[PDB]
């Protein structure tokens, strides 16, 4: 429940928090592409 | 031929997506308590 005019975005608001984590994740993807 | 990392991440997400499914599945899944 965000202000009425934002109704459209509950979907994203929903995900935004996962991102932080996502970074430690990516950090690996790159390290892998760069053969350690 | 196909870059090695590219197979890892897509192989990984699957484990992270499939596993993720499993956690949802425990909330509505038969094994929920409703």
């Amino acid at each position: 429940k965000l202000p009425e005019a934002y109704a459209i975005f509950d979907p994203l608001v929903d995900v935004l928090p996962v991102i932080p984590v996502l970074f430690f994740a990516l950090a690996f993807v790159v390290q892998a592409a760069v053969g350690f | 031929r196909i870059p090695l990392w590219i197979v890892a991440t897509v192989a990984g997400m699957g484990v992270i997506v499939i596993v993720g499914l499993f956690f949802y599945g425990a909330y509505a899944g038969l094994g929920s308590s409703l």
Binding site: P11, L12, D14 | -
Partner: peptide
């Protein structure tokens, strides 16, 4: 409802930078 599709894109946003970087060059 939709929430899932829109999460998808952001998630594959990061490995895409790795890809767009593979092709072009730099970083190294």
């Amino acid at each position: 409802i939709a929430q899932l599709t829109m999460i998808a894109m952001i998630g594959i946003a990061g490995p895409m930078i790795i890809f767009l970087l593979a092709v072009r060059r730099g970083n190294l």
